[PDB]
DNA sequence: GTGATCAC
DNA sequence: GTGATCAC
């Protein structure tokens, strides 16, 4: 899915950004939780990374 | 190790 | 084909 609300993240050149990612889904084995994750672009860079998406932010 | 994703 | 993303 891509994502609407925006996300505070720490971006790879090291600054707080709040950026909406442009896609995300959960990561998780079988019989255990795992994380959501987003994939999001640094504005500063152009520079794609991924971060972990609060446990409540919606796939 | 396991899970999904995609820019590189 | 894989790095890198996290929590268990």
Same mark, same amino acid.
């Given at each position: !899915? !891509? +994502?609407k609300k925006p996300? #505070?993240?720490k971006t790879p050149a090291g #600054?707080?950004?709040e /950026?909406? =990612?442009e896609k995300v889904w959960a990561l998780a084995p079988k019989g255990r939780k795992g994380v959501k994750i +987003? /994939? *999001?672009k640094? =504005?500063?860079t152009g #520079?794609? *990374?991924r971060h972990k /998406? =609060?446990?409540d932010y919606p796939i």
């Amino acid at each position: !899915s !891509s +994502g609407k609300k925006p996300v #505070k993240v720490k971006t790879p050149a090291g #600054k707080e950004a709040e /950026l909406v =990612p442009e896609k995300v889904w959960a990561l998780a084995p079988k019989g255990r939780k795992g994380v959501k994750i +987003g /994939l *999001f672009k640094d =504005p500063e860079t152009g #520079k794609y *990374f991924r971060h972990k /998406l =609060p446990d409540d932010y919606p796939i």
